[PDB]
Amino acid sequence: DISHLRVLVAEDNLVNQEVISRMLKQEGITNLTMACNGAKAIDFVKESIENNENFDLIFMDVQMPEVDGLKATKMIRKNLQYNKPIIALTAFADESNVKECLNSGMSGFITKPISKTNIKKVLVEFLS
Ligand SMILES: [Mg+2]
């Protein structure tokens, strides 16, 4: 009952992209877009708003080259006016970097490595 969702995953680690994609597919997601950095992420969101192929949810790796997840999240929130959930993927969450994430406009976070339970929880909490 979740094949209606369209999900964007921004992750600069290709092994990680495959892992999260497989998890999302196992949960029933069929509409998935991968972004290798924050610049690609911004580009994909802009298109989705224009074309009514809107993303229901974004998973945003915090640390990526060229444009990181924090900069991408700020652009997506404030420039593109995207107001749906953005979930940070973080290798390390401490007081300083969490405040930075929240200030960027993140809706929540998962510490890497992610588990299927984390995906299920995000879906029920944000997209029920
Ligand atoms: Mg990364």
Short mmCIF file of C-alpha atoms and ligand atoms in Angstrom, two decimals:
data_model
loop_
_atom_site.label_atom_id
_atom_site.label_comp_id
_atom_site.label_asym_id
_atom_site.label_seq_id
_atom_site.Cartn_x
_atom_site.Cartn_y
_atom_site.Cartn_z
CA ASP A 1 0.00 0.00 0.00
CA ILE A 2 2.94 2.39 -0.41
CA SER A 3 3.52 2.15 -4.20
CA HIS A 4 1.97 5.63 -4.50
CA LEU A 5 5.08 7.19 -2.98
CA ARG A 6 7.82 8.89 -4.96
CA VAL A 7 11.10 9.01 -3.06
CA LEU A 8 14.38 10.84 -3.68
CA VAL A 9 17.59 9.48 -2.17
CA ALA A 10 20.69 11.67 -2.17
CA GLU A 11 23.78 9.62 -1.37
CA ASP A 12 27.30 10.01 -2.82
CA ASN A 13 28.18 6.37 -1.87
CA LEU A 14 26.92 4.07 -4.69
CA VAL A 15 27.07 0.91 -2.54
CA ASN A 16 24.85 2.75 -0.05
CA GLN A 17 22.42 3.81 -2.80
CA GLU A 18 21.96 0.14 -3.79
CA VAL A 19 21.37 -0.89 -0.19
CA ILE A 20 18.73 1.77 0.55
CA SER A 21 17.09 1.21 -2.84
CA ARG A 22 16.71 -2.51 -2.11
CA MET A 23 15.24 -1.72 1.32
CA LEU A 24 12.75 0.77 -0.16
CA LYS A 25 11.74 -1.69 -2.88
CA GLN A 26 11.24 -4.45 -0.28
CA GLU A 27 8.91 -2.06 1.58
CA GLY A 28 6.88 -1.59 -1.63
CA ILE A 29 8.34 1.59 -3.19
CA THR A 30 8.45 1.47 -7.00
CA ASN A 31 9.15 5.16 -7.77
CA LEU A 32 12.70 5.95 -6.70
CA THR A 33 15.25 8.56 -7.88
CA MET A 34 18.92 8.60 -6.86
CA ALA A 35 21.06 11.75 -6.60
CA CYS A 36 24.87 11.56 -6.20
CA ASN A 37 25.25 15.02 -4.65
CA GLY A 38 23.31 18.04 -3.40
CA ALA A 39 23.41 19.79 -6.80
CA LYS A 40 21.68 16.82 -8.45
CA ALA A 41 19.25 16.66 -5.56
CA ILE A 42 18.23 20.31 -6.08
CA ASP A 43 17.87 19.75 -9.82
CA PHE A 44 15.60 16.73 -9.29
CA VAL A 45 13.33 18.47 -6.81
CA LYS A 46 12.90 21.51 -9.04
CA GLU A 47 11.76 19.29 -11.94
CA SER A 48 9.38 17.30 -9.72
CA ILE A 49 7.52 20.44 -8.57
CA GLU A 50 7.23 21.72 -12.15
CA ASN A 51 6.06 18.40 -13.62
CA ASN A 52 3.69 17.26 -10.85
CA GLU A 53 5.91 14.26 -10.18
CA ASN A 54 6.43 15.53 -6.65
CA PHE A 55 8.60 13.69 -4.14
CA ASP A 56 6.66 12.61 -1.07
CA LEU A 57 9.89 12.24 0.91
CA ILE A 58 13.62 12.89 0.53
CA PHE A 59 16.42 10.97 2.21
CA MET A 60 19.39 13.33 2.27
CA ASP A 61 22.94 12.24 3.01
CA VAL A 62 24.55 15.02 5.03
CA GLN A 63 28.08 14.77 3.62
CA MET A 64 28.39 14.86 -0.15
CA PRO A 65 30.85 16.58 -2.53
CA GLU A 66 30.16 19.73 -4.57
CA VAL A 67 26.99 20.61 -2.63
CA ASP A 68 26.46 18.90 0.72
CA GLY A 69 23.14 17.86 2.25
CA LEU A 70 22.86 20.91 4.47
CA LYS A 71 23.25 23.36 1.57
CA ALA A 72 20.95 21.23 -0.59
CA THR A 73 18.30 21.08 2.15
CA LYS A 74 18.38 24.89 2.61
CA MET A 75 17.98 25.42 -1.15
CA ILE A 76 15.18 22.87 -1.38
CA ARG A 77 13.36 24.36 1.62
CA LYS A 78 13.80 28.08 0.96
CA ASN A 79 14.44 28.48 -2.79
CA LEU A 80 12.20 25.62 -4.05
CA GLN A 81 9.75 25.95 -1.10
CA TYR A 82 9.57 22.18 -0.65
CA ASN A 83 7.74 21.53 2.64
CA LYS A 84 7.60 17.71 2.76
CA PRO A 85 9.81 15.45 4.95
CA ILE A 86 13.57 15.50 4.49
CA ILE A 87 15.35 12.82 6.52
CA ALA A 88 19.09 13.26 7.04
CA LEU A 89 21.41 10.25 6.73
CA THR A 90 24.32 10.90 9.11
CA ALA A 91 27.43 8.88 9.98
CA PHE A 92 27.83 10.73 13.27
CA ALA A 93 25.31 12.79 15.23
CA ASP A 94 26.57 15.14 17.96
CA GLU A 95 25.17 18.31 19.56
CA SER A 96 26.91 20.78 17.21
CA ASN A 97 26.24 19.04 13.92
CA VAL A 98 22.64 18.19 14.88
CA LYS A 99 21.81 21.86 15.53
CA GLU A 100 23.33 22.65 12.11
CA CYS A 101 21.12 19.95 10.51
CA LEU A 102 17.96 21.22 12.21
CA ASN A 103 18.80 24.80 11.18
CA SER A 104 19.15 23.64 7.56
CA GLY A 105 15.52 22.41 7.67
CA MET A 106 15.87 18.64 8.22
CA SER A 107 12.72 16.89 9.43
CA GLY A 108 14.63 14.13 11.26
CA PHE A 109 17.65 11.84 10.86
CA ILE A 110 18.83 8.24 10.76
CA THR A 111 22.34 7.25 11.77
CA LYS A 112 24.18 5.17 9.20
CA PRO A 113 24.23 2.33 8.61
CA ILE A 114 20.46 2.37 8.14
CA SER A 115 18.15 -0.53 8.88
CA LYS A 116 14.83 -1.57 7.33
CA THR A 117 13.16 -0.67 10.66
CA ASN A 118 14.28 2.92 10.24
CA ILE A 119 12.61 3.07 6.82
CA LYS A 120 9.35 1.57 8.14
CA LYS A 121 9.36 4.00 11.04
CA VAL A 122 9.86 7.01 8.78
CA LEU A 123 6.98 5.86 6.56
CA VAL A 124 4.46 5.35 9.38
CA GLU A 125 5.40 8.54 11.27
CA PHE A 126 5.58 10.95 8.32
CA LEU A 127 3.50 9.40 5.51
CA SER A 128 0.47 7.75 7.10
MG MG B 1 28.19 10.95 1.94
#
